[PDB]
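Figure 2 data, in text form.
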Amino acid sequence: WYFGKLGRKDAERQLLSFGNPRGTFLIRESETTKGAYSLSIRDWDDMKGDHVKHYKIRKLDNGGYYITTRAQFETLQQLVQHYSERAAGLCCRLVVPCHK
């Protein structure tokens, strides 16, 4: 999936779009972090209802990508595959990718 390098505003307006069930995710390029990635997940809550949290995907200089220090992945494709099954410490698991 190549979403692109877009801002939180653009990621939010897209994720929170009707036609996507909660657990919508996209990975945009982080403009705040040095060419990194942001796993932008659309959560649902009753009080925090329909909000996006972006997990900052970090990169091992001598390795691959990791969202957390719990475990590092070979590639970004592995990172999402784990969260597609289970949240494993995230707020939500990955349900569906966002539509452009």
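Caption note: Residues 78 and 88 are 13 Å apart (CA to CA).
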